[PDB]
Design a protein around this ligand. Structure first.
Ligand SMILES: [Cl-]
Ligand SMILES: [Cl-]
Ligand SMILES: [Ir+4]
Ligand SMILES: [Ir+4]
Ligand SMILES: [Ir+4]
Ligand SMILES: [Ir+4]
Ligand SMILES: [Ir+4]
Ligand SMILES: [O]
Length: 124
């Protein structure tokens, strides 16, 4: 089975490029990272920072997760990200996305030993 931590890297980590280079990006990346398999996943975010920078967030600002748990962490600095958001006309299996680059703080849920990101909660 895929670990939660590896799933986070697959769904949210793209260190290779520093900033989007779009409008292709979300369409190819959602596809290539297996996020258009079961459904068109409506929203997803990719983080354009080193794995180490993102992992470090687990020891930064402790905040409440959206689901009411306490194991979420907000990055002290903003990070280069890309929000992928399905279009109104997107129909499975041909999943269509709008690519939006931004620099924002990320919020991630962390667990396990080692204590690493396992879910992307939000950006702010
Ligand atoms: Cl496996
Ligand atoms: Cl800010
Ligand atoms: Ir396995
Ligand atoms: Ir890619
Ligand atoms: Ir800020
Ligand atoms: Ir996710
Ligand atoms: Ir979880
Ligand atoms: O910030």
């Amino acid at each position: 089975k895929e670990t939660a931590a590896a799933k986070f890297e697959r769904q949210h980590m793209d260190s290779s490029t520093s900033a989007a280079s779009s409008s292709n990006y979300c369409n190819q990346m959602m596809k290539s990272r297996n996020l258009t398999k079961d459904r068109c996943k409506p929203v997803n975010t990719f983080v354009h920072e080193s794995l180490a920078d993102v992992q470090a967030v687990c020891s930064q600002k402790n905040v409440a997760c959206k689901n009411g748990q306490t194991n979420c962490y907000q990055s002290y600095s903003t990070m280069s990200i890309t929000d992928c958001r399905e279009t109104g006309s997107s129909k499975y299996p041909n999943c269509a996305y709008k690519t939006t680059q931004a620099n924002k703080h990320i919020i991630v849920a962390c667990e396990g030993n080692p204590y690493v990101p396992v879910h992307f909660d939000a950006s702010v």
